[PDB]
């Protein structure tokens, strides 16, 4: 997983030399911004049942066949209701892990790398998702930095799913 | 490699859990140790070079076995190529003291190493102690309380002998 | 690899023989079976996708422990590489129909795979079962009697069925 | 050995692809073809002894100091004249396996590659051998399709010897 | 690789002395026989394909289940490997000639080369006895007194057997 | 180690040939410079002691700080003098292996390579050496092609430290 910290090592190492000035201030940077992150992920975390049910109506709400029309993709059924759930509790717990490591690294590996392969397979929307995640970014209810960061990494998935 | 917010992050992905906020708590206070842990960084890279040298005299010092004609470091190749050792393991100790975590120091490292060296002919027990010197000199350069704002370092400097340990035990 | 008529051909020159009227009249049959054998390559390729995804499904539901946290084909990454190597023996296992001769699923795909799966920690046992899976859903594709000429396709069913019964052994 | 089949394969894995309608329409092609391979190649066999003392002996005809001159390479004994009906021999069954595979795949495997290292290493002309295929593409009573098959093998094998 | 000079060097290094009066006079003695030597090479060299094809001959009268039907040296292109195998080896016969050392001969040539050919499935046995064979075509030929300035070379050719009987063991 | 000799079977290897009457002619003169060389060597080698003590105290003349500071890379004890005594043996002994073996070889793998990691991480000075090795050039005491031939990895040496 690439956090600010594994990049500059592999950076370095990739050249066969010991850290730089340069990459210790990367830490810093790092440090600096390390509880806002911390912060926004407790926050989220101790909302999670609301944001996540909130995010599961939203998308049905705007694609109410969704609900309606019979389908293993669907969620018709209490079956295809969970998978949803479910599916979007690990998009919110996944963000908060991004926030927590000051990187993109937990998204790319545990949900990015090969999401096109999955919904293309289980014929799922992306567009289901993208509706999820903004209803998430505006009932979060975070601010200042807390909320900048979280909204960072909850449009970098929005655009991964675009 | 992980570093040391991810470490954490993996282990409760595997469980399928949020961070709690005991967790959170941890890492908050390792976010406020920081500037320690970049202090030890660029002590030790600062100094790499009298660190490798100090500990090469060191040991060969204690065993001479290892430099008369038929020893293992004897000629200008094999002595360059033991030396060249010491300073990848000391870079690869830098790396996972700024991560916080000695997964690159393994995976990138360690792994295979003892094999290697059995392979080669290199005395595995001879590096171990080499690998002790250089923990003793650059310990004392990070650990030294000239020109360095006052405060307890005693948990950075563990995990960094941590470290130096590790590396040791993976080939003696 | 070989195929149905190089399979015999080997047999025999190892041997420093022609082949006998015997073996050329089976040869002849399995020439006047030729649409059936193209005909079951056309619909599991045309099919694929639809037979991987049906197959995963069925798989998942009776394994739900592959993709809880944890699990071997929990996270994006895994699952899609779960689906790849899916795709990968069906893809295979329609080169061997083609052909007429296991050869090259097995020199190509199945050798070493069983090896493969056990230093990466891929539960063998449960890619058997996918494959399983997919035999189940190509073969109801593979011998659907509409908008095709009426025959006996049996013995090509039969044959298909094995190449994907000796993907099956070779990792379980 | 390659036969049309197993180049289509070939085609379609070096692509990492599932085979194409034009590598199927292939597959009919050889199948169409198949049948006349299989009657010429019980025809040549039916005819082994005939065909292959009647070459040899055609060999002789146009090289006679092969059977007078003393020599390993040469047949001026018995022992040479074993070895040179031996590998008349085995050029006409290789020809067979071509023919019931459906391509050169037997002859460039089995004869050709490495034959001029052969010829080269015990002192073989490869034109004794084009004399030898010659007589058999006259001789073979094949007719059709079944000749056409035969001799676009017989063929091959000359122009590889020249 | 080493040669006879180098040989004796190393030796000598790995016990921190310089080479005695003894060992001097040795290489001085070596120097003088150096036409005998290089004649060796030269004619195992120009004659290289006699020796290949003529000990091939012979291996193949003696052992006919190799090149019958279904044998390891059965078909055009295992002929031709073998042959060039034959020739390999010849190859680097003449280069520890050459050098007056085995080690060239035993590190790019003979080393793991029995493990590789039981992989391959070649009788190890059956390549002794090409070697041997091209031992003896290429001693007659080294040792023929016609054209060249009278003298004993049986030194000289009791080394030439050596790294002859040296691959022929490798293998066998 | 490179040698006349290692050197043309290396060529000739790298080609996958034969060795050639250009490398034969190699050998040739490899063998008549063989004799001169030995000889040299044997005459370095007896004055061994007398050699190196005398370039050991021509380095403190011209270096004479080398005995008066303090320090692991000097020689102002009894120990650093006999790490100096040391090197200088070890060029000496080496050079006569470059002798017996007509080649560059020994020097380049005994000494040369890695030497200024070696300098520079031990702080020990390459002129200190290079005064010893003239020392040696100007009191070895030999003359003709035996003279030529010592002075030719003398000089090598030397150029190497430079
Ligand atoms: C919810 C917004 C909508 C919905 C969802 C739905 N999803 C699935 C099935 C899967 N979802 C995933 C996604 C992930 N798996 C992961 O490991 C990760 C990273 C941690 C992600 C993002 C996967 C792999 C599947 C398939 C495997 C499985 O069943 O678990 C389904 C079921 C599809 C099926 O055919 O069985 C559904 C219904 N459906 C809706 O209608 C909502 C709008
Ligand atoms: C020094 C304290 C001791 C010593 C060392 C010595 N090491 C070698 C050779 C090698 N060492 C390594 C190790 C690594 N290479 C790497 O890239 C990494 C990072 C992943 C490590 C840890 C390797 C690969 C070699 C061999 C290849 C090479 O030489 O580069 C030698 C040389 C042995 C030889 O004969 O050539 C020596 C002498 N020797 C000692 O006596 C000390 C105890
Ligand atoms: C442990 C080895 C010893 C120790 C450490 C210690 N350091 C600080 C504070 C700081 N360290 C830095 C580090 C850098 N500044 C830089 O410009 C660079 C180069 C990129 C580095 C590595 C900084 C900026 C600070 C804070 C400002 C300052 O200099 O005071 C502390 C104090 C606390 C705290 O974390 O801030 C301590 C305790 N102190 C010791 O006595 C050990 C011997
Ligand atoms: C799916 C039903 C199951 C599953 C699969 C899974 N496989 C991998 C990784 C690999 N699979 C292969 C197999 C092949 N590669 C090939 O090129 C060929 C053709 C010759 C085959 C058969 C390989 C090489 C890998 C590793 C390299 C790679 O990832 O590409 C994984 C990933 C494991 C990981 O941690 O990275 C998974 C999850 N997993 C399951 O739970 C199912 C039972
Ligand atoms: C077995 C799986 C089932 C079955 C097969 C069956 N097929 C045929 C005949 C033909 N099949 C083809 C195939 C193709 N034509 C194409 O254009 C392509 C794409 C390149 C393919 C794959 C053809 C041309 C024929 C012959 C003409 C026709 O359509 O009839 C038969 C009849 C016999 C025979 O071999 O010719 C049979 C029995 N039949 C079944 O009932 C199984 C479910
Ligand atoms: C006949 C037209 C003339 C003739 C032939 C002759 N051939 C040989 C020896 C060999 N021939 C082969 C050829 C093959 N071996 C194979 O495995 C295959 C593919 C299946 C072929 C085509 C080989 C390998 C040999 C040498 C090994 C052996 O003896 O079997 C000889 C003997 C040469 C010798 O020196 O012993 C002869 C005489 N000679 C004639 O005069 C005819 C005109
Ligand atoms: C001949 C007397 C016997 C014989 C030989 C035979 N050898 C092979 C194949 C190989 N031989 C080698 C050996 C080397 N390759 C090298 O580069 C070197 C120098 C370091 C050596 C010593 C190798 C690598 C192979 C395999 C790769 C290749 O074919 O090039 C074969 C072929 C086996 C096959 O089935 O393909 C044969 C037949 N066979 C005999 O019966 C004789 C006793
Ligand atoms: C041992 C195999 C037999 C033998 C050898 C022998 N050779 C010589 C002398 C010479 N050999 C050469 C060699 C070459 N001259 C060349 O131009 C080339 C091509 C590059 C080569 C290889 C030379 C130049 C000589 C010296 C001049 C001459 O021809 O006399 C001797 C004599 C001694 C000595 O070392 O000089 C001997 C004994 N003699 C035998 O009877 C063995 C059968
Ligand atoms: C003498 C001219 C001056 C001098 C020398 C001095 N040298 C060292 C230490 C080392 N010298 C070497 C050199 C080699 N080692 C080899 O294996 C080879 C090839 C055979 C060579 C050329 C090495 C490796 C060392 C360090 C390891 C060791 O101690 O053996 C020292 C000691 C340095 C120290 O810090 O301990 C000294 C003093 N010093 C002078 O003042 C002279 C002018």
């Not at chain 1, 999670?48 to 709400?61: C, F, I, K, T």
């Not at chain 1, 790398?113 to 293309?120: H, L």
């Amino acid at each position: 997983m690439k956090t600010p910290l594994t990049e500059a090592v592999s950076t370095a190492d990739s050249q066969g030399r010991f850290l730089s000035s340069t990459e210790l201030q990367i830490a810093f940077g790092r440090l600096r911004q390390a509880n806002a992150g911390l912060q926004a992920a407790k926050a989220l975390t101790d909302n999670a049942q609301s944001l996540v049910n909130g995010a599961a109506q939203a998308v049905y709400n705007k694609f109410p066949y969704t609900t309606q029309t019979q389908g293993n993709n669907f969620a018709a059924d209490q079956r295809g209701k969970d998978k949803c759930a479910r599916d979007i509790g690990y998009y919110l717990r996944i963000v908060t892990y991004c926030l927590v490591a000051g990187g993109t690294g937990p998204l790319d590996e545990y949900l990015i790398a090969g999401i096109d392969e999955i919904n293309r397979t289980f014929d799922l929307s992306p567009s289901w998702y993208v509706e999820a995640l903004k209803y998430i970014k505006a009932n979060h209810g975070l601010s200042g930095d807390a909320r900048d960061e979280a909204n960072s990494y909850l449009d970098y998935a929005i655009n991964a799913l675009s | 490699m992980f570093d040391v917010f991810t470490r954490v992050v993996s282990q409760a992905d595997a469980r399928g859990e949020y961070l709690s906020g005991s967790q959170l708590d941890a890492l908050s206070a390792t976010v406020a140790e920081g500037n320690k842990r970049i202090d030890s960084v660029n002590r030790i890279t600062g100094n790499a070079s009298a660190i490798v040298s100090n500990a090469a005299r060191a040991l060969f010092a204690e065993q001479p076995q290892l430099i008369q004609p038929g020893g293992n470091a004897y000629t200008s190749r094999r002595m360059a190529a033991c030396l060249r050792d010491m300073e990848i393991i000391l870079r690869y100790v830098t790396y996972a003291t700024f991560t916080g975590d000695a997964s690159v120091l393994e995976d990138r490292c360690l792994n295979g190493l003892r094999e290697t060296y059995v392979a080669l002919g290199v005395p595995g027990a001879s590096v171990a102690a080499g690998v002790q010197k250089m923990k003793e000199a650059a310990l004392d350069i990070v650990n030294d309380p000239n020109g360095i704002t006052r405060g307890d370092c005693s948990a950075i400097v563990a995990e960094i002998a941590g470290y130096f340990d590790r590396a040791a035990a993976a080939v003696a």
